[PDB]
Amino acid sequence: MTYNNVFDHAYEMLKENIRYDDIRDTDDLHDAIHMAADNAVPHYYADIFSVMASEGIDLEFEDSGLMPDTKDVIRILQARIYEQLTIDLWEDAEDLLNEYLEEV
Amino acid sequence: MTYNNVFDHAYEMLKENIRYDDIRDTDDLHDAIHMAADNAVPHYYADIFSVMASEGIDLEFEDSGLMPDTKDVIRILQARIYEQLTIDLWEDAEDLLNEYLEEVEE
Amino acid sequence: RDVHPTHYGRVCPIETPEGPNIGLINSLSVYAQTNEYGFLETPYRKVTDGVVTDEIHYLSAIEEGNYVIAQANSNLDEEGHFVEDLVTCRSKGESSLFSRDQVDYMDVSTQQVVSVGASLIPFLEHDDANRALMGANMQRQAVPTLRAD
Amino acid sequence: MARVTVQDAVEKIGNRFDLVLVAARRARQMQVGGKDPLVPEENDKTTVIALREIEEGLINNQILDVRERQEQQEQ
Amino acid sequence: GQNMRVAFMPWNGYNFEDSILVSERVVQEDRFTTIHIQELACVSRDTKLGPEEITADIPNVGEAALSKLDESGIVYIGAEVTGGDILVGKVTPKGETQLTPEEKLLRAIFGEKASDVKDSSLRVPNGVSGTVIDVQVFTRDGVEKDKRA
Amino acid sequence: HARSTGSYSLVTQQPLGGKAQFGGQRFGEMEVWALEAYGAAYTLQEMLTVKSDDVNGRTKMYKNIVDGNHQMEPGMPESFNVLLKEIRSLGINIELED
């Protein structure tokens, strides 16, 4: 269980969401990808912390407005995991729209 | 998996600190624990997210005064390892004090 | 770790050890006594309308939350008549000026705000609080001397 | 003569860092043997003697190289 | 503690911020001369083989050190131990070495390793001086320690 | 404090020094950076290997002080050798160049 396993799981869930919803528009990918961000993250805190021990994810933030305001630790790192997975899934969703238009 | 190595290293360094500073009470014996809490903790986020993923440490706190109040997560995750190490090493320090009085034939 | 005004005569704010745990060990004061339930109670003498009765009672926190407690340093003659029209007093911990008959309690002696550890130091008004704490940490350790003057 | 600051020895050759190794390679020959000091001792150690020999401006890299080649040719 | 005559002045530097300058008369009066009584806790190891009792007559000890000990490895009450002096005789038991084909001359001279290779005596680690006070050899039910106690 | 060179020490002079119960450590983690701030190299070299973490080096330095040689013999004594034996144990080795 590393970052590449969560990456492949989010890739497979995004392929399943494109196959189910049949979305061919770039602006209409808002309902899928965030759900692909929602179902790919783990709930156990050790499964969260085991992903951070591998390469592929960083601690720096692209946008500070996506981080919530809390006093804990797991919420900030969890939102960082959501942000890194969405940054991956935009460029993944472009190539999956290409493969969906060139597949069937 | 990796918390056991940090625990063994902290136990060894704390045993060497009580062996070196040769104090024989339970009231003033805390500066050797400050040596263990400041040295045995890992530095950057790689081992910190690696040790806490392993068993032996939890998120909840025993004492309310040692919890830091900041927005940086790495300070809180370092003070977590420090506080858990002091709580898990107080009783081991007293056990090695009980073993310490008749350990070395001198 | 901070000080609440219930810590007046029950425990002392002075005696704390010099380690990291400073503020959490409160030594019990001179005149305080544990009640039969388990809470601490410091004595107060009864004040009537005309005279001051020499008997004492033991008051708890729930009782003193509604009662009125006078200060320790206030004037008193031989009989018990209050010669001051405006005696400086307090109600719930903060000092505020009351009348001569709005209080019905009085401190027995001027010793309840300090425990037995720092009661050996004369003039605790004229010393700073942290320095009185430091003097307590000096008095907590001393080898006996041979002459013992 | 207790030396306070070696700065007057830095006025001859200014690096503050060559002086230690030059004084060390000068004083190893006086500590082991087979050499005589050019400055008489003022009841001190060889360290103060090395500082005063660098301060007087008698020993530098060139004199050490010439004496090293002379000791290699004599041996 | 004890009180002394204090002069409130800045001196020649011997009191910088809170330092203390004392007199020689305080040393002359033997004032606050501390008396530290430490414990000599002796041990007699019991192994699987060999006798159990720690006795006297330990070799490789000079006669100047053996003159201050009584029988069964205890010193007289009033004898001064200074650093490496022997207060109690440490004895390794006679096991673990009788079934040895080698070192027969070592077993004849300094048998069964009665002393260590190069260690100090078991009284106090070095740097001290002082006399003994009281010996507290306590016995077991059926142990035969009459000659020592 | 300040124990002397005592016997029965296999690493870091920790067992059987001159004290009640002795142990040799705490040179510090900030004092090393202070010696870096001065630019001290040979004092830091003693803090690395010879004064700190060598068994043969203490005997060589004791012979140099007692015999009157006063020779430091600088280099990398028996710590980088342990590092080479632990790195070259795997499938990767360490060469030797200028």
Added chain:
Amino acid sequence: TEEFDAIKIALASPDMIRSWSFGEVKKPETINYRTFKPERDGLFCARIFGPVKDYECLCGKYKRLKHRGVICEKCGVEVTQTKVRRERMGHIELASPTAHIWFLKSLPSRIGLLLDMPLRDIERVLYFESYVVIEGGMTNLERQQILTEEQYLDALEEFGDEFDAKMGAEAIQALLKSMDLEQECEQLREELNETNSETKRKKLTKRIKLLEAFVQSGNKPEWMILTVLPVLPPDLRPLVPLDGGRFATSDLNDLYRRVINRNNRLKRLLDLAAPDIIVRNEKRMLQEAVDALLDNGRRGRAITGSNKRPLKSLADMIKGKQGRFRQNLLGKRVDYSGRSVITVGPYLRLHQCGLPKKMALELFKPFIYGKLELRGLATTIKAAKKMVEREEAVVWDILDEVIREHPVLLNRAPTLHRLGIQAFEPVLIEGKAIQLHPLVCAAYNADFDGDQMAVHVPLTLEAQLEARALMMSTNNILSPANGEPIIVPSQDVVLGLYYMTRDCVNAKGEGMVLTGPKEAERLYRSGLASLHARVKVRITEYEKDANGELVAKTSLKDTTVGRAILWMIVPKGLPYSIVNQALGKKAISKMLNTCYRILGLKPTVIFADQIMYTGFAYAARSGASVGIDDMVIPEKKHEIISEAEAEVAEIQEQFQSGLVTAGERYNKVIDIWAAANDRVSKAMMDNLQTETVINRDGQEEKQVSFNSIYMMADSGARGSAAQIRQLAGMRGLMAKPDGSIIETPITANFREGLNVLQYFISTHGARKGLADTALKTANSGYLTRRLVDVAQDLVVTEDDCGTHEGIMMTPVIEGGDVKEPLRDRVLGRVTAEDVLKPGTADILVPRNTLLHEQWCDLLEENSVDAVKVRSVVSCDTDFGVCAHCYGRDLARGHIINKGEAIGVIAAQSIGEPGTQLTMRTFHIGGAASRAAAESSIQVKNKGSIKLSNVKSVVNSSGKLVITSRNTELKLIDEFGRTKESYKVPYGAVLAKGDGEQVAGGETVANWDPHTMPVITEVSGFVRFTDMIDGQTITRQSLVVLDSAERRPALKIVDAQGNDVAQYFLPGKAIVQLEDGVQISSGDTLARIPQDITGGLPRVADLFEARRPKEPAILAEISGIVSFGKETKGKRRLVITPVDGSDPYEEMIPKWRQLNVFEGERVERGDVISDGPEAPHDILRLRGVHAVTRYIVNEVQDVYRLQGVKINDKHIEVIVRQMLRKATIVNAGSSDFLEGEQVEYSRVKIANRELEANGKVGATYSRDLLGITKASLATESFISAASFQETTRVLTEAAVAGKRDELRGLKENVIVGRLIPAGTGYAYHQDRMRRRAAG
């Protein structure tokens, strides 16, 4: 032996291992537990690694070992290389070579895996159920596909003969040999040039750079698969983590005999020709044994270690057991250094301290042994050990010969900076405690209450030279971080010189016509006090009117006796105006500062020592006492208190009135009691006059008193007014951590008797102030830890920097009065070739000079505006820094030398402030409001003013207001120096018309944070809009519309009868008028109002370079920018039309403010002021200059809130260390759109423009990521990631083939060598010159 400079970690060849050790091994009977004898050959036993005891061999014949290169029966004869233990290792022979697990699993699949194949399928085909077919062809499948048992059966049925597929790594070897590396690199460069997927870009660049590492590494990747493996020595093993065993009964022996047993069973079953399932089981168990021997073989979380699995990983014993942090972290045998209680010694001039007798008898025990061997007094070593024990007189004579001129180090345990350890000279002191020099307490940051200090003995001659050359207290006079002198007298010498130079009226002795001056002889004999009146004595004095000489003069001056005695202390003629006043901390510190500036270094140390001696010797003769007569009570104090409580009673009447709320009553109580505290402070200051007088009456001041507390308060050394007011008068308020305070504070003082409630409430101040000490210590240590961890790879290596470009030095301050002048910033740094007078064709320096106080006096007597300063980053230096820009090195006076360690002084300069800032500047109250009357923006100093970024707004009145966002003011002081940084608000109401200048008075601005500059320039009524509900729900004459929830800009009305400028959107807009109302120009149309510096986490936010809460988007080169500019359907503010094309169109998520209204053409580097600025965009567009000024001025704005002063050189060095990771745009020779080193980029540009190419590789942009990867940007594996896993770094540096090339300071701490700094760099340069010389 040789040294270790730059060695790669390349793959060990099988031929190099067969030449490393040669021989045959069979029948592993390694260790017999019942014999303990040298057995036969075996593996990892006494037959290998030579003998087990030092010089002998038990083989049966030839124990002398004449020949070399044979293994005869049972011993190792061949050594041939090194000593007994450091010789060759050995070898094991595998029948099936298995691959290394660190390439197969590089956490995760990082390096050693990619071959256009996923990780899971490669993990599956290395198991027992799948395999990879090799050398195929003429089918539909390929060689990269995966097969099962039935699929490979069908494949061998269809393909027939010549089918090859092996279960082990031999098929991987044949596939890697069949694939050409150069053709694969060409195909991947073509796929990089053709494809456009963004996730494909980084993968193809990683593939191309890894294959270039394989090509320019010059080695075969098939050496990654382990064929022949060497073993490790048995004594390389440490003891087990459990109870003490032996080296043969260790934890590694079971895994070793398991691997060797499976190897021999594989050999036996291949000699027996076992069937396929048996040999596949043997290869599977062999691969499992190798994978369990190398690492633990974890796949996921690894939920539970299997009952403390004995030596699961080799990396765990490399990193954890032996320790990656092996040197200088655990402490490692302090070895003749010890602690004691520090006392004071009022003698032993500055380069000397005390040392106890019984400690110094023991500290030099081998030196005593060596000198007793040298003098011939001790024959044997046991005779010397007996002579030490006897303690006779000749042993003390030899010890006096030892300690006579030998240095030592005194070293406290908190060393937050470099002056915590200082070298001195020991002198024997009777007792067990250490006497210290009195004035070294501020450098040690501790008082004499039993604090300890280790006593490090320099054991080598070079360590003695390091102590006496660099670490003495006389070498360091100034501070190495500020320039202020660190040796400051503290309340002893200060009080002695204050009582010495104190004047009196009508004392004994008058009209002293004296020569010599010799005013101490009549003080000593009779009739003269040292505090006499103004007498005229003859005082000679030296001056420096001649260059390099001394000009003596002679004059009679009116002075006191103590100043005449103090002039005998002063050598070589200091100026007289600095000793003609009262001496406190400031005066004596300024005297020592001017003595250091004038006389140099040699007279100022004996001056400071003699000042200390006379201060001690006259403070002993002073005899100041603190009595009850010294403490004074104000005579009106109670009355003031009565007045105070009377006012409280009036407020109490307001408390019964119902007009004053709770917080207003609290603020009035705070104000009344603070005014009463100020009145009793002034009453105490008036009552300190005329207490202890001489016999004189009828004067005005009437003999200013000589009590001790007023002398300590006026001297200003330790006696401050904030504690004299707590001694006498009124104590006032206290400090409570909850934030509240009582309403009737302490009326009495420590002179009078306090109440029990007053002491009970005053205990809370101690409770608040005690908790500050223990907190934030580990955080301040961890900040310095990271600042050293990011900045350890910088040493001085060259002589000349060679530039003309540098950071421009501009004098800037904070708001209000002046804080730091320009002369403090010009002093230090070496300037450039051009400094300019306001007169033309006038220069000062030809090229450069060493800027000291004479050039500062030349710039002070002349007029200067801006100074061009040679400085950092710009003119980078290969492999370090030239540091010629680093001029006037602190605590020393000289030009800068090579080999100075830079960066570890920087973290000690940044980390030197304490545990918590104290910026309350008052009690817990104070009634701190937002604005009392106005913001009060005006000018103070004389000179003409210049307004920046302003307009010409048409108004009806004479004044001309502005509506701009950023507005700066330039002031003329000397030649254009501003020295007044007034923060002008965005669109301030200016009372002065634009285009006119005035100096002196006439306050030009009056701004109130309730208005907004949204007005009309042309007179006319309001443009008619539609009033609909929904837009009136906004928050902080009625509002009509709103542009945030949808004031939009419309056409301005230009006629009074016709219904006809640009209105920006600040975020909040409330319409203050009605549509159809006749209004004139310059009136109220619609007005409503709508970076963070200071703090200890603010320092972390500065030096981590994190992204702020509101990022900023800057402006590039000129293009048509205007509101709307063809915005899309969603996600507004997209600027499509740009003249000059420049296809760069950014997309804004509408959260940002409206950018521009004016400036239809812009430039690269324009500010947008979108809250906090983004430093990475300024680094990409503007350059290094504005980023450096931004970081340095924010660090200084943090530092000025507490009064600490740190020079900008250290901060700019940290900025230089944070400007690595230079990303390129134009593709070069060996790089394509990646980030590499700046020095390597300069080397590549120089090699491009040097010989052949015109320009290959240019226009690179820097990065300011901060603390994470810049500390990991050290390209040597020995300090690449020391905290992280060791073998993870070793595999990357093994495949990449990187060189160490000797830049770093913690590198030779982790490895252990002479560090290339200080005198070690001299040894480095001497070795590099003697290598080239022969």
